[PDB]
């Protein structure tokens, strides 16, 4: 796709998120780069409003699937790049098992040479002693399978997946993600056959960063269509 040509090299990224979880407001800014040829993201995020009221790993999925590596035989199924530069709206509900949920709405698009992801998040019905507000999740991240199907009548896609977050005591907090993406522009997009993305992420810290933050290294590769 024409949009695909925008990802042939290293692309700078800006992320902005305004959140409100059980009335606790906060803001996060991130910057870094994506190299879709390798399916690779490197990003650093800061909470600019003070301490983050939720654990960092709960925000990873919210905080640019246009950087996925699509193998050559699957390039016709890459909705995300095909929507660029005009971009797409990405909406989710994330249901944390036995706990509250996030609803998110984001716009992902190019502004000059930069891929921007701007997001609004609202969290409700969380338990004060739960694993989220109680900060009981370990600072790490698992590997997931992100399922994608077409939504032709909206000229977009529907996406679903579950993430697994290690809890300090050895149990696992599940989060069911249900997601919809729509193009911002009117132009044609690639509507894919059913497939999925493999993800894996490493979370770390900057030893010189005093603010509450998260350093992230992530790899995303499309699969599920046979070669």
From Swiss-Prot:
The organism's place on the tree of life at top rank: Eukaryota
Quaternary organization: Monomer.
Reported impact of residue 199 to H/W/F: Results in significantly red-shifted excitation and emission maxima
Effect of residue 189 to A: In mut1.5; shifts fluorescence lifetime from 3.03 to 2.72 ns
Species name: Aequorea victoria
InterPro entries assigned: GFP, GFP-related, Green_fluorescent_prot
Function as written in the Swiss-Prot or TrEMBL entry: Energy-transfer acceptor. Its role is to transduce the blue chemiluminescence of the protein aequorin into green fluorescent light by energy transfer. Fluoresces in vivo upon receiving energy from the Ca(2+)-activated photoprotein aequorin.
Protein's name in the database: Green fluorescent protein
GO biological process: bioluminescence; generation of precursor metabolites and energy
UniProt keyword terms in alphabetical order: Chromophore, Luminescence, Photoprotein
Phenotypic consequence of residue 65 to M: In Citrinine; leads to excitation and emission peaks of 516 and 529 nm, respectively
PTM statement from Swiss-Prot or TrEMBL: Contains a chromophore consisting of modified amino acid residues. Maturation of the chromophore requires nothing other than molecular oxygen.
Tissues expressing this chain: Photocytes.
Pfam families assigned: GFP (PF01353)
Result of altering residue 167 to L: In R10-3; matures to the red-emitting state with excitation and emission maxima at 555 and 585 nm, respectively
Effect noted on mutating residue 99 to E: In mut1.27; shifts fluorescence lifetime from 3.03 to 2.85 ns
Known outcome of mutating residue 64 to L: In EYFP; leads to yellow fluorescence, folds faster and more efficiently at 37 degrees Celsius and has superior solubility and brightness
Biotech applications: Green fluorescent protein has been engineered to produce a vast number of variously colored mutants, fusion proteins, and biosensors. Further generation of mutants led to more stable proteins (at 37 degrees Celsius for example) with brighter fluorescence and longer fluorescence lifetimes.
UniProt family annotation: Belongs to the GFP family.
Keyword Coiled coil: no
Result, substituting residue 194 to I: In mut2.1; shifts fluorescence lifetime from 3.03 to 2.50 ns
């Amino acid at each position: 796709s024409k949009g695909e040509e925008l990802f042939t090299g290293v692309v700078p990224i800006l992320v902005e998120l305004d959140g409100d979880v059980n009335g606790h407001k906060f803001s996060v800014s991130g910057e870094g780069e994506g190299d879709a040829t390798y399916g690779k993201l490197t990003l650093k995020f800061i909470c600019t409003t003070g301490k983050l009221p939720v654990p960092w790993p709960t925000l990873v999925t919210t905080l640019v699937q246009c950087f996925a590596r699509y193998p050559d035989h699957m390039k016709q199924h890459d909705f995300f790049k095909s929507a660029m530069p005009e971009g797409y709206v990405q909406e989710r509900t994330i249901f944390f098992k036995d706990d509250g949920n996030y609803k998110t709405r984001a716009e992902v698009k190019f502004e000059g040479d930069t891929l921007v992801n701007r997001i609004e998040l609202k969290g409700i019905d969380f338990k004060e002693d739960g694993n989220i507000l109680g900060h009981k999740l370990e600072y790490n991240y698992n590997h997931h399978k992100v399922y994608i199907t077409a939504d032709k009548q909206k000229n977009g896609i529907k996406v679903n997946f579950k993430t697994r977050h290690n809890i300090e005591d050895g149990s696992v907090q599940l989060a069911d993600h249900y997601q919809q993406n729509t193009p911002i522009g009117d132009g044609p997009v690639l509507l894919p056959d059913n497939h999925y993305l493999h993800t894996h992420s490493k979370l770390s810290k900057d030893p010189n960063e005093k603010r509450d933050h998260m350093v992230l290294l992530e790899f995303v590769t499309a699969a599920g269509i046979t070669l």
